Paper text:
One specific mechanism used by nairoviruses is the production of a deubiquitinating enzyme, termed the vOTU, that disrupts the innate immune response. Interestingly, the nairoviral L segment also encodes a viral homologue of the ovarian tumor protease (OTU) at the N-terminus. Instead, the vOTU’s primary function appears to be the reversal of post-translational modifications by ubiquitin (Ub) and the Ub-like protein interferon stimulated gene product 15 (ISG15). Each vOTU possesses a seven-stranded beta sheet as the core feature, with five major alpha helices framing the rest of the structure.
The vOTUs from DGKV, QYBV, and TAGV readily crystallized and were solved to 1.62 Å, 1.65 Å, and 2.05 Å, respectively. These vOTUs represent diverse nairovirus species, and possess extensive variation in Ub activity with the DGKV, QYBV, and TAGV vOTUs possessing low, medium, and high activity towards Ub-AMC, respectively. In QYBV vOTU, Trp72 packs with Pro85. Additionally, it is in proximity to His79, suggesting potential stacking of the rings. In contrast, for QYBV vOTU there do not appear to be any direct interactions with the selectivity helix. Instead, Lys109 and Ser108 form electrostatic interactions with Asp15 and Asn16, respectively, suggesting a role in manipulating the positioning of the β1-β1a loop. Specifically, direct interactions, or the lack thereof, work in conjunction with the other interactions to complete the structural features. This is most notable in QYBV vOTU, in which Phe14 appears to pack with Pro76. In contrast, the DGKV and QYBV vOTUs possess more polar residues, including asparagine, glutamate, and threonine for DGKV and glutamine and lysine in QYBV. Despite being phylogenetically distant from CCHFV and the other robust vOTU DUBs, QYBV demonstrates substantial Ub activity and possesses Ile130 that could pack with Ub’s Leu8. Further, increasing the hydrophobicity of the pocket in QYBV vOTU was able to enhance Ub-AMC cleavage, boosting activity by 150% and 50% for the Q19V and Q128A mutants, respectively.
Numbering used by the authors: 2 to 156
Write the structure that this text describes.
């Protein structure tokens, strides 16, 4: 029961986490992303544009929100000194998206972002969430081994 039986526990700022056990195919259809280091941005691109091909625009909008709204990003502050530092690192070859950008996008887009942990391509066992919504009002990502992210579309 994804709408009522989840015990989300505060982590930090707008981030919470939970043990939540379900076969993801009962609630979602999975859309694969290219297995490169841009997979997080590819998954969000699929949500925004119906194609993973716009992943650079997602990286761009994260950098821009860091510049215009730096004060609202305490999670980002744990890892980056200022917006210019974030822009420098996120443009680098080999940068991998994740929790930093989940915070940024939840606040830029004003919706919830959820990472659903799944290690056997069937069963989710944990969630981590930025924002206060449930999965129907969220960007849902399947978070599998080696920090690969695929996109999940609610049924």
């Amino acid at each position: 029961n994804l709408k009522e039986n989840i015990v989300w526990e505060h982590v930090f700022d707008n981030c919470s986490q939970a043990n939540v056990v379900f076969s993801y195919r009962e609630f979602f259809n999975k859309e694969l992303t290219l297995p490169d280091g841009n997979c997080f941005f590819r998954a969000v691109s699929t949500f925004l544009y119906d194609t993973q091909n716009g992943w650079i625009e997602v990286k761009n909008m994260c950098r821009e929100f860091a510049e215009t709204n730096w004060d609202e990003l305490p999670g980002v502050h744990q890892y980056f000194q200022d917006p210019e530092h974030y822009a420098r690192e996120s443009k680098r070859e080999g940068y991998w998206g994740g929790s930093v950008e989940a915070e940024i996008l939840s606040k830029l887009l004003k919706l919830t972002v959820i990472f659903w942990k799944c290690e056997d391509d069937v069963w989710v066992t944990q969630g981590i969430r930025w924002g206060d919504g449930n999965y129907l009002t969220a960007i849902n990502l399947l978070h599998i081994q080696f920090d690969h992210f695929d996109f999940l579309v609610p049924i």
